[PDB]
Design an enzyme around this catalytic site. Structure first.
Site, PDB file in Angstrom:
ATOM      1  N   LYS A  13       1.009  -1.236  -0.121  1.00  0.00           N
ATOM      2  CA  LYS A  13       0.040   0.005  -0.011  1.00  0.00           C
ATOM      3  C   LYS A  13       0.966   1.352   0.077  1.00  0.00           C
ATOM      4  O   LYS A  13       0.704   2.196  -0.823  1.00  0.00           O
ATOM      5  CB  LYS A  13      -0.971  -0.029   1.314  1.00  0.00           C
ATOM      6  CG  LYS A  13      -1.796  -1.235   1.294  1.00  0.00           C
ATOM      7  CD  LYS A  13      -3.036  -1.136   2.499  1.00  0.00           C
ATOM      8  CE  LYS A  13      -2.328  -1.220   3.708  1.00  0.00           C
ATOM      9  NZ  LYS A  13      -1.692  -2.343   3.808  1.00  0.00           N
ATOM     10  N   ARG A  88      -9.781   0.193   8.386  1.00  0.00           N
ATOM     11  CA  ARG A  88      -9.281  -1.171   8.531  1.00  0.00           C
ATOM     12  C   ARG A  88     -10.584  -2.157   9.341  1.00  0.00           C
ATOM     13  O   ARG A  88     -10.208  -3.214   9.671  1.00  0.00           O
ATOM     14  CB  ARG A  88      -8.204  -1.095   9.420  1.00  0.00           C
ATOM     15  CG  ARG A  88      -7.077  -0.416   9.049  1.00  0.00           C
ATOM     16  CD  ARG A  88      -6.299  -1.330   8.045  1.00  0.00           C
ATOM     17  NE  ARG A  88      -5.053  -2.037   8.826  1.00  0.00           N
ATOM     18  CZ  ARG A  88      -3.807  -1.529   9.040  1.00  0.00           C
ATOM     19  NH1 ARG A  88      -3.519  -0.127   8.678  1.00  0.00           N
ATOM     20  NH2 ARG A  88      -3.045  -2.215   9.738  1.00  0.00           N
ATOM     21  N   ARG A 160      11.205  -0.360  11.077  1.00  0.00           N
ATOM     22  CA  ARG A 160      10.008  -0.267  12.195  1.00  0.00           C
ATOM     23  C   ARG A 160      10.283  -1.305  13.040  1.00  0.00           C
ATOM     24  O   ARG A 160      10.114  -2.361  13.058  1.00  0.00           O
ATOM     25  CB  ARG A 160       8.690  -0.127  11.365  1.00  0.00           C
ATOM     26  CG  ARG A 160       8.278   0.883  10.554  1.00  0.00           C
ATOM     27  CD  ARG A 160       7.232   0.835   9.713  1.00  0.00           C
ATOM     28  NE  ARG A 160       6.132   0.081  10.131  1.00  0.00           N
ATOM     29  CZ  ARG A 160       4.967   0.207   9.730  1.00  0.00           C
ATOM     30  NH1 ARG A 160       4.582   0.685   8.392  1.00  0.00           N
ATOM     31  NH2 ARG A 160       3.701  -0.485  10.313  1.00  0.00           N
ATOM     32  N   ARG A 171      -0.294  -8.724  13.542  1.00  0.00           N
ATOM     33  CA  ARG A 171      -0.721  -7.974  12.725  1.00  0.00           C
ATOM     34  C   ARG A 171      -1.354  -8.763  11.620  1.00  0.00           C
ATOM     35  O   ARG A 171      -2.522  -8.162  11.227  1.00  0.00           O
ATOM     36  CB  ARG A 171       0.394  -6.816  12.101  1.00  0.00           C
ATOM     37  CG  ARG A 171       0.898  -5.906  12.969  1.00  0.00           C
ATOM     38  CD  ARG A 171       2.422  -5.524  12.840  1.00  0.00           C
ATOM     39  NE  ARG A 171       2.403  -4.732  11.668  1.00  0.00           N
ATOM     40  CZ  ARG A 171       3.382  -4.681  10.652  1.00  0.00           C
ATOM     41  NH1 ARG A 171       4.575  -5.141  11.049  1.00  0.00           N
ATOM     42  NH2 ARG A 171       3.232  -4.032   9.503  1.00  0.00           N
TER      43      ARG A 171
HETATM   44  N1  LIG Z   1       5.382  -5.673  -5.377  1.00  0.00           N
HETATM   45  C1  LIG Z   1       6.267  -5.980  -4.515  1.00  0.00           C
HETATM   46  N2  LIG Z   1       7.057  -6.770  -4.550  1.00  0.00           N
HETATM   47  C2  LIG Z   1       8.122  -7.183  -3.538  1.00  0.00           C
HETATM   48  N3  LIG Z   1       8.059  -6.430  -2.420  1.00  0.00           N
HETATM   49  C3  LIG Z   1       7.432  -5.462  -2.397  1.00  0.00           C
HETATM   50  C4  LIG Z   1       6.266  -4.794  -3.550  1.00  0.00           C
HETATM   51  N4  LIG Z   1       5.549  -3.794  -3.040  1.00  0.00           N
HETATM   52  C5  LIG Z   1       6.186  -3.662  -1.817  1.00  0.00           C
HETATM   53  N5  LIG Z   1       7.186  -4.152  -1.518  1.00  0.00           N
HETATM   54  C6  LIG Z   1       8.249  -4.338  -0.363  1.00  0.00           C
HETATM   55  O1  LIG Z   1       7.495  -5.243   0.763  1.00  0.00           O
HETATM   56  C7  LIG Z   1       7.572  -4.155   1.795  1.00  0.00           C
HETATM   57  C8  LIG Z   1       6.003  -3.859   2.275  1.00  0.00           C
HETATM   58  O2  LIG Z   1       5.496  -2.810   1.603  1.00  0.00           O
HETATM   59  P1  LIG Z   1       4.816  -1.582   2.049  1.00  0.00           P
HETATM   60  O3  LIG Z   1       4.380  -0.667   0.805  1.00  0.00           O
HETATM   61  O4  LIG Z   1       5.608  -1.015   2.950  1.00  0.00           O
HETATM   62  O5  LIG Z   1       3.109  -2.324   2.360  1.00  0.00           O
HETATM   63  P2  LIG Z   1       2.080  -1.773   3.250  1.00  0.00           P
HETATM   64  O6  LIG Z   1       0.781  -2.295   2.656  1.00  0.00           O
HETATM   65  O7  LIG Z   1       2.335  -0.372   3.196  1.00  0.00           O
HETATM   66  O8  LIG Z   1       2.262  -2.326   4.751  1.00  0.00           O
HETATM   67  P3  LIG Z   1       2.316  -1.582   6.324  1.00  0.00           P
HETATM   68  O9  LIG Z   1       2.715  -2.576   7.387  1.00  0.00           O
HETATM   69  O10 LIG Z   1       2.390   0.113   6.186  1.00  0.00           O
HETATM   70  O11 LIG Z   1       0.827  -1.741   6.920  1.00  0.00           O
HETATM   71  P4  LIG Z   1       0.252  -1.950   8.538  1.00  0.00           P
HETATM   72  O12 LIG Z   1      -0.833  -1.526   8.358  1.00  0.00           O
HETATM   73  O13 LIG Z   1       1.084  -3.016   9.609  1.00  0.00           O
HETATM   74  O14 LIG Z   1       1.092  -0.705   9.082  1.00  0.00           O
HETATM   75  P5  LIG Z   1       0.565   0.531   9.038  1.00  0.00           P
HETATM   76  O15 LIG Z   1       1.429   1.461   9.003  1.00  0.00           O
HETATM   77  O16 LIG Z   1      -0.831   0.988   8.306  1.00  0.00           O
HETATM   78  O17 LIG Z   1      -0.216   0.752  10.520  1.00  0.00           O
HETATM   79  C9  LIG Z   1       0.590   0.369  11.685  1.00  0.00           C
HETATM   80  C10 LIG Z   1      -0.335   0.376  13.062  1.00  0.00           C
HETATM   81  O18 LIG Z   1      -0.956   1.631  13.263  1.00  0.00           O
HETATM   82  C11 LIG Z   1      -2.329   1.015  13.604  1.00  0.00           C
HETATM   83  N6  LIG Z   1      -3.184   1.394  12.427  1.00  0.00           N
HETATM   84  C12 LIG Z   1      -3.122   1.846  11.347  1.00  0.00           C
HETATM   85  N7  LIG Z   1      -4.058   2.112  10.832  1.00  0.00           N
HETATM   86  C13 LIG Z   1      -4.969   2.002  11.605  1.00  0.00           C
HETATM   87  C14 LIG Z   1      -6.445   1.881  11.509  1.00  0.00           C
HETATM   88  N8  LIG Z   1      -6.888   2.331  10.366  1.00  0.00           N
HETATM   89  N9  LIG Z   1      -7.516   1.612  12.632  1.00  0.00           N
HETATM   90  C15 LIG Z   1      -6.563   0.971  13.554  1.00  0.00           C
HETATM   91  N10 LIG Z   1      -5.462   1.128  13.844  1.00  0.00           N
HETATM   92  C16 LIG Z   1      -4.418   1.381  12.827  1.00  0.00           C
HETATM   93  C17 LIG Z   1      -2.168  -0.217  13.939  1.00  0.00           C
HETATM   94  O19 LIG Z   1      -1.904  -0.675  15.450  1.00  0.00           O
HETATM   95  C18 LIG Z   1      -1.374  -0.854  12.803  1.00  0.00           C
HETATM   96  O20 LIG Z   1      -0.725  -2.063  13.123  1.00  0.00           O
HETATM   97  C19 LIG Z   1       8.377  -3.002   1.759  1.00  0.00           C
HETATM   98  O21 LIG Z   1       9.588  -3.630   2.253  1.00  0.00           O
HETATM   99  C20 LIG Z   1       8.642  -2.724   0.139  1.00  0.00           C
HETATM  100  O22 LIG Z   1       9.372  -2.196  -0.250  1.00  0.00           O
HETATM  101 MG   LIG Z   2       2.247   1.763   5.236  1.00  0.00          MG
END
Ligand SMILES: Nc1ncnc2c1ncn2[C@@H]1O[C@H](COP(=O)(O)OP(=O)(O)OP(=O)(O)OP(=O)(O)OP(=O)(O)OC[C@H]2O[C@@H](n3cnc4c(N)ncnc43)[C@H](O)[C@@H]2O)[C@@H](O)[C@H]1O
Ligand SMILES: [Mg+2]
Ligand SMILES: [Zn+2]
EC number: 2.7.4.3
Length: 217
Positions: A13, A88, A160, A171
């Site tokens: 994402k 989410r 992270r 997660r």
């Molecule tokens: N095609 C491809 N091929 C190969 N490799 C690839 C690729 N595309 C990308 N990659 C690689 O693979 C990796 C991943 O890609 P990347 O693009 O970073 O993936 P992502 O989908 O953005 O994953 P995130 O973990 O940000 O999602 P998450 O929800 O755990 O974290 P979030 O920050 O939103 O949220 C964090 C925390 O905040 C809280 N939170 C956030 N939003 C909410 C909500 N809406 N409600 C409640 N809690 C929330 C929760 O506690 C949550 O756990 C990278 O190394 C990248 O280079």
């Molecule tokens: Mg992200």
């Protein structure tokens, strides 16, 4: 273009968000980013959030919806926006519909970047992000030009805290549980679209661009 990206942790994402924001100049609204910023800044919401994030649990809905409502009302969202990892939960999605109704900025498409869980541990544990601008890299799949240095601002990259094996497994469970209800919600709305996220990042972006091409920029 009023957009949502959805997908499991590690699905790509953020990686697609970076490319969409570069191409179209819309605001990137990432609740994980917001929560991590607040945590770094030590605000009451940041410290509350830190507890959930450290475990891999979702932050509760109402606080989360609050920050999004506030963000989405800004003038910079008049000509489009990109929500990344919100909503989410169904309750989040229901509140978002109301929010967008009030300010007259209804969603164009929800983009589900679909990735199977069995590749996500390696995606997340090798993830490295810039301390300054948040640009995303992967030590195998997408390394910076110089090790440990962001290609965009030259900032230092880091891992992270939540991209550790135990918290990753939590997660995945927590978010997988929310997925089918949330996907069904938007499928019933009619504007859910799926993108295969198990392709090279460039090909994933090509599919995203081709879906967005029907929208005004
Ligand atoms: N095609 C491809 N091929 C190969 N490799 C690839 C690729 N595309 C990308 N990659 C690689 O693979 C990796 C991943 O890609 P990347 O693009 O970073 O993936 P992502 O989908 O953005 O994953 P995130 O973990 O940000 O999602 P998450 O929800 O755990 O974290 P979030 O920050 O939103 O949220 C964090 C925390 O905040 C809280 N939170 C956030 N939003 C909410 C909500 N809406 N409600 C409640 N809690 C929330 C929760 O506690 C949550 O756990 C990278 O190394 C990248 O280079
Ligand atoms: Mg992200
Ligand atoms: Zn950077």
């Amino acid at each position: 273009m009023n957009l949502v990206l959805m997908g499991l942790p590690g699905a790509g994402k953020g990686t697609q968000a970076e490319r969409i924001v570069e191409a179209y100049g819309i605001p990137h609204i990432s609740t994980g980013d917001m929560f991590r910023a607040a945590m770094k800044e030590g605000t009451p919401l940041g410290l509350q959030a830190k507890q959930y994030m450290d475990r891999g649990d979702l932050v509760p809905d109402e606080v989360t919806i609050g920050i999004v409502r506030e963000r989405l009302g800004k003038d910079d969202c008049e000509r489009g926006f990109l929500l990344d990892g919100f909503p989410r939960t169904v309750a989040q999605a229901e509140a978002l519909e109301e929010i967008l109704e009030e300010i007259g900025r209804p969603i164009d498409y929800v983009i589900h970047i679909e990735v199977r869980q069995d590749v996500l541990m390696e995606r997340l544990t090798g993830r490295r992000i810039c301390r300054n601008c948040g640009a995303t890299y992967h030590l195998i799949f997408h390394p910076p030009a110089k090790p440990g240095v962001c290609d965009k601002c030259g900032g230092e990259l880091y891992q992270r805290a939540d991209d550790n094996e135990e918290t990753v497994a939590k997660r995945l469970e927590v978010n997988m549980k929310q997925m089918k209800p949330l996907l069904d919600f938007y499928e019933q709305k009619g504007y859910l679209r799926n993108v295969n996220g198990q392709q090279d990042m460039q090909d994933v972006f090509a599919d995203v661009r081709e879906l967005l091409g029907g929208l005004k920029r």
